[PDB]
Amino acid sequence: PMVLLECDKDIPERQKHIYLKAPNEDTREFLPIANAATIPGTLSERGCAFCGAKLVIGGVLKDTIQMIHGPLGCAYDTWHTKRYPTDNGHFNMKYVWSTDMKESHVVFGGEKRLEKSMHEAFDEMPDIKRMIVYTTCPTALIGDDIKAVAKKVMKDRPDVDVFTVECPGFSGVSQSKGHHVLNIGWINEKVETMEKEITSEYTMNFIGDFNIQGDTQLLQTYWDRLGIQVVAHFTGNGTYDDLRCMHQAQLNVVNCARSSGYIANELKKRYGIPRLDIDSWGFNYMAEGIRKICAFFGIEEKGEELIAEEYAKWKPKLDWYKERLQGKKMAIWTGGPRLWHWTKSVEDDLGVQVVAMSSKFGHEEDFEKVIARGKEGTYYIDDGNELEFFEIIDLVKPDVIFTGPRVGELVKKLHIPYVNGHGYHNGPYMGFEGFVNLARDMYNAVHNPLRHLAAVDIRDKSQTTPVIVRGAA
Amino acid sequence: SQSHLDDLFAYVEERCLWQFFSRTWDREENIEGVLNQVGRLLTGQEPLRGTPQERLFYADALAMANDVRERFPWASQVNKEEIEFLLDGLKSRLVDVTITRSTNRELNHHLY
Amino acid sequence: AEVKLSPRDREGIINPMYDCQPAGAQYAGIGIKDCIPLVHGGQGCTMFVRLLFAQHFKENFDVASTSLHEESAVFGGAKRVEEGVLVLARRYPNLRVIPIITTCSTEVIGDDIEGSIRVCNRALEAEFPDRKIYLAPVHTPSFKGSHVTGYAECVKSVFKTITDAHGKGQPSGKLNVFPGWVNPGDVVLLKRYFKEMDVEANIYMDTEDFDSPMLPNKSIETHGRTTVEDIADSANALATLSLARYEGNTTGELLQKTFAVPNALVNTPYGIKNTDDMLRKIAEVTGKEIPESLVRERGIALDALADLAHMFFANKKVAIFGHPDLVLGLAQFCMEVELEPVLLLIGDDQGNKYKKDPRIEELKNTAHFDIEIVHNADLWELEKRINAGLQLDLIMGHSKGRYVAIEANIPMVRVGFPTFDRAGLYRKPSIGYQGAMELGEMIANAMFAHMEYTRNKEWILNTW
């Protein structure tokens, strides 16, 4: 049924956002409302639309200036917070740019301030010739026309290319709006503005993977082995110009259908490129994915050789962790997709029971997926808040929670260990080896002497301090 | 036939993603495309592999056909007509739950 | 030799040194017991700052958003403020203080915060008759100043609000102390100094418990310790000691103007002399003697630093960035130990104030090497100067500068805020005598490791 938590008695609309799956229910009658307005004052986990454009997607690129048109805080706030390495010395994580909007620009306009800042950026780093310009709350409110500024700069500096995104933080309800605006602008303006050499009979784009701790580089070892050219990664370890070539691919492979399904759908509509959704987390899921790709291409034997070698390498370790993790209870409190990518894969491959899940910004489509895959007796929460999190912990008593670091530091006080569900502990977590990495971190998190020590009150004469026995795969 | 159909439906719900595409018209296309190829594969017919979309439907259907043959001993015992009937039932169930009765408010939005 | 002040010469920023005003206001607020700040703006303005505090402290701090969305951008956001205050109050029965912090969005659209406060005060009075919640309007447009200015503004507004409600009472005998934006370890040190000097004092804000235990009973103790009652008693103090010109002195000035509590602003107590001068001021206002224990801690510091100064520090060139009170104070500490702070970077638009800071004169009359002080600086200004050939032996600054030092192969000591890329720094003092010693030691140890990694006379670390 839908659940009214005790902590929500004064915000009882929240009942329509929380589903407890019970036997025999028709789940079509219990789909949480999702992607609706936030309730003020709740300590919702949600971020802003600008975040979804710049931090999540655009900022992943290795060769592009990220010009945030606004006051300096939006820039500071999206710098030193992500874990998306590159093969060029991590230029993306080392720098952030701002137009340093001042009061006089609010009053008189910021377009000349933006134009100046853009030329300065290109002057300070003469090897960088690509730029994305984002609006933020106040530059949207004052109506600066960043597309027109961009056009002027490209006329004045014919060796650069500039893309613009209108994504002030108040647009939409969450990060999700930023994903949408960026995806549709990119396909409308920049796809099919360049071409590259095709070097394989088999070509794909990999859409919706942001190279968290090297996930994309790990998957790339698969595609290289298989002889598949990846025209563009959207956007892990990617380049601006690769993204201009997306129309050349034969196949679009989608992992993050939330952030990046938009561009896959438009590529299909406009260019006829088929969309294949996979799960690139999960051990048996990764095998299915590879088999689908290879069947599409007609390279089935090459796929089976890769799969066999990966299972010989990694399956014994995975099974060693399953033996120790079987029956453990997990919660997943992340953006959305990882709920449906992980609930059944950790169950199948590790024996882990996901007892509660919360999505900051997922849509009803994400809830359809996760409820389809998820267990009975589990809580499914759209746009969860802090008090709810406490009440859920008391209801389900998880052994481990996969969530962001701040919430991890909070639940630590309850002696519940965490794994960073967003930026990982010791990743990558995608692919065959990655799921073993995920399992190892779950195991170390749970089978941790400090947890046991923290429970002991040294004043209690009836209590001793225990000694715990760990293992390694 | 009801228990067999219940088996197929529980499989697709817990495993597959193609029935959960972003819009109604994509769900409809995928339910029909993939399940037609599943029927071919389960009954020994040559799959369609002409166009890029047919090739993708084959790839999705091959995972399901192989899984169904592994999981369900009945799928190797029933005849071609019974397979076809089941898959028609499965199409109608998947439309029902992913389209007709889904409360996903984005399903009919004309723009992606 | 010249100490020159110059502005950044670019309009735009690359690698900002500070966050915006609302972030500093949030920081102020999380030091108050039973306080949840409410940030009136878009959601990122809250969530990104809660993350920043988790990076620095490795703790969660409660801050709520009004969740400004598109409708409010067209018609105004007051209903979001008013809903947010009530939803906080209804769901957090022990909540006492809500600083209502504006952002760029809500400054631009002009929402009437004081009007919303009147509405909310009426609603709260009616719904919760036996409760008092203090709503403080905090005007923090992000398009001026920085998180330094925002911290100062929030402290002042909170103090105004709570003291307006309670007024002047019976003399407390206590000092008010505004240390500015310091670590829990700095607060621990000051508490110790006041205890050793038998001086009763409230430290605003008392953030010692941000370093909270993991307890057998599972309780959460990660809270500010400064209460309403402590803030209200400010009006009754003997004196205010303000340690940071840009981080609280304006509240000491407000309490002087309103309640005739005399405010004494001193140099922020980085290094030996500034600590000496602080303690002399305390003695002067309280009539209490400096204790022997502080003479001994000072002497232990001096002894430790004397093992370092002429051997490892002399003539070494240092760049320092961070809050203005920290940068100016650390430059003075560096010179006491024979380091040469040749580049000081201060990261906001308050240059017209900084040109009048007396510590600049104090540098001008002591330094024997040219010093460049870049105001309105970003961290690209440091990188660019290194790339143009500035030879540095040491950088002192916060963790968002780390890649400058890493790539230039220059040792870096992490000071100020945020220091996320090393463990435990929030617990170590940087001010006072113990702090000077710990800073000096961090410097030396950073140098020593550098010598080892680079094979630069690494054999010398034996009989120093």
Ligand code: CLF
């Ligand atoms: S919801 Fe998102 S992060 Fe917030 S402002 Fe808006 S785009 Fe940006 Fe920016 S400068 Fe500071 S952090 Fe805000 S108050 Fe403005």
Ligand SMILES: [Mg+2]
């Ligand atoms: Mg089922």
Ligand SMILES: [Mg+2]
């Ligand atoms: Mg000694």
